């Protein structure tokens, strides 16, 4: 089955209200940039971002010119002529609107609070979808907390019920309306709802992991923002998931959540796979089409793992644009983020940047020795490894933020489609490296094992293995006279 | 923060 | 308030049927050994053991001669004439009857299953109590597990209501019928029901901790069976309580249950105290009136912490009674355990035993160099430290297994009474030593702490501390924008005064 | 086992 290729298409209210396809200074990446060729390479385009208003309904930003908005959306849906499988989804949320201290955070918390709020909100999502011509709903709340999770789950289930009905009513069996959410790609934010993962994903077609920004200006030392695997020389982190409300024993928590660990894409995928009831096919691996820049770094190792002087605050509290050669940075007033397009041009010029490669993380990085700069990003080469990983792990596909950051030739997007679909591309011999793999083992990813059937009335010594009710269990200590599942002395270690 | 976050 | 001194009086159905007070060979410790003086030293006597039959009712072993049983019980209840506050309780259970593989285990599990079964069982307990002249009920199920705990808790509550009612009916306000249970003293068995300790203890007058047998043939290394405090040189164990169904985070389990740890009396007691709703006044510390013997031990350290060749299977498989000097062992066909009375005679008989002392665990032990033997037991000296511990930790008192194992003079019983009640005994200067203390901290015994109130909308760094809703919390990582109690970045570390 | 247990 075809891997999903989900591209976010983010467009600010100011750019919609002044939309044009002839002046990159106002609209840097208009829909016209998405040619029939590229439209064919994508499976989904996530139009971003919409919000939830104080009336607890889905809605466009208040400053949005609805007429312009409809026209932009129409240009996107127009792309479906070139790709019968293409879906134009819309995303609700994002950082600015939904983070704990974001402008509409309350609306999110409130909208999922009651059976009645959830119904009104669910109805509004479907209504927005049909009124503007979208093909599904994406929810990007960053991120619901433990006490809001049950409500969040109930709202998703409600939306699923409505979309399914709408699909039948519209005869959309060939391209059913979908529901997805952007999920945290790092243990810290993931810890907020991790315990109810199975329930969160049940009503979804896909959970799109934000497996990037795993390094930022808020971090102590510069690091790769989306390393596939771990680099023993890079920083390690506290495994926040051992603190999720899972209800597991110390033994269980410990084997699933090594701490500290390397904050990697592999870690995030495996952490999701460890949960029972989370199918790999619904997991989509996100990749970034932008890089994160650090200044004041110490040379010595390409600039990796060094202290820096990058303002981690948001917005960027300065007019100092230190990312040399990045006009985009001055334009958007922030030298900490740069699109792959800009970065490519930065390498194209002299600017004194050197592109290095980390064979453990399987990702590239830029280093500017003269100004002590470090840029972590991804490219067509790092994508080969991520694509192979997605196939090996039988994930649902890839997602990326965001389309408007690819180069004019659409090389990053073309690479992703090529690695999954080209008849003449073969990665069977691609060397995945020796980077550190996440070693955690949980209920959802237990090894297949065999063992004698547990026998009631038998006394087991420490370390004994038995099969009972589908799994293979091991005794944690000796003189065990009770059954697996009834005596806390048994540890589930294998399946089948 | 800065992008998707 | 007077410390409780609870002595178990265990007598096999066989000794009951052939009860005699003039033949040590038939009944090693007849009730007549308990003089009025000894009777005054006890607050409770737990007559052991009765059982639960297939009809799911409390009952005597079927092979019990009822008339002889009543005679034995009367001899015990008569002791009350020398001590108005003495209660003669009866214990239901014991190892042979209630361990997982015991003959009557199923009856304990089924008796507590429903309101109907629980009511009938409780009624039978009070009925046995009144019929034979007992002053209370003690349950020694070793031990309830998993799905059995709620039924067990409901059964204790049902007994509690019937006992109180019977107290009124009998106008026993001056000496109310009591309910107690024997609880595990080691974490492995304790983990079975640990998470519900508060609920289990609520209906009880006391929970008597079996704080002994912390070492046994089943262990690979010889060790003291009732160390008060830990010895760094001794073996350590994985703290099974972290596998109990508590629902605590990784940080909480780790703080509450250091592992490996020293299996000691102090650990058991502190493990019980860590749980909210478990009052120290209901905690009774058990001490052993017997020692456990090991053979094939190495020398160098008095036989402590050595491999050995002691059979652990029960019953004793062999016929080799290798505990030199112990005639009790031959009689009972097991060289693995000897009463204090017998041990004392072994020392007196010059059979090659050296009595040694471990100043960390605060306990004595015997070492037999010639034959490679090791014995862990307790004596009047170790009791000094445990008695002070009981007073210091404000526990309810002491319990011991068992009366029949004291020497003829009743020195062990007399020492316990002396340390709690004698005007001419003073332990204010007794040095508790430098052995290892159990220092786990559970969300049920958090220290009093102070911190600036939490401020909504604030971003906190790692390690920050804030007071919020009755507790003080600490962040496990940085950039925290959530409220404590919420999400999982906050760790509850203290109580708000 | 052997005693109380």
Q: Quick one: how many beta strands of chain A? A: 17
Tell me about the largest β-sheet of chain B: none
> Can you tell me the CATH superfamily of the largest domain in chain A?
Glycosidases
The total domain count of chain A is 3
Number of strands of chain B: 0
Q: Per the principal axes of the C-alpha atoms, what is the gross shape of chain A? A: globular
Number of helices of chain B: 0
Structural class of chain B: little secondary structure
PDB class: hydrolase/hydrolase inhibitor
Keywords: chitin degradation, hydrolase-hydrolase inhibitor complex
Assembly: tetrameric
Entry title: Complex of a chitinase with the natural product cyclopentapeptide argadin from Clonostachys
Notes on the protein architecture:
The complex is a heterotetramer, with two copies of chain A and two copies of chain B (5 residues). Chain A has 496 residues and is an alpha/beta fold. Chain A folds into three domains: 356 residues, Alpha-Beta Barrel (TIM Barrel); 90 residues, Chitinase A, domain 3 (Roll); 50 residues, Seminal Fluid Protein  PDC-109 (Domain B) (Ribbon), CATH 2.10.10.20. Chain A contains 15 helices and 17 strands. An eight-stranded parallel β-barrel of chain A has the order 1-2-4-5-6-7-8-14, surrounded by six helices. Chain A has a five-stranded antiparallel β-sheet with strand order 10-9-13-12-11. Chain A has a three-stranded antiparallel β-sheet with strand order 15-16-17, with no helix packed on it. In chain A, α6 crosses α7 and α14 runs parallel beside α15. Chain A starts with a strand and ends with a strand. Chain B has 5 residues and is largely without helices or strands. Chain B has no helix or strand. Classes of the chains: A alpha/beta (496), B little secondary structure (5). Chains in contact: A-B, A-C, C-D. Chains A and C meet through α10 of A and α10 of C. Chain C: Keywords: Carbohydrate metabolism, Chitin degradation, Glycosidase, Hydrolase, Polysaccharide degradation, Signal. Chain C: Its EC number is 3.2.1.14.
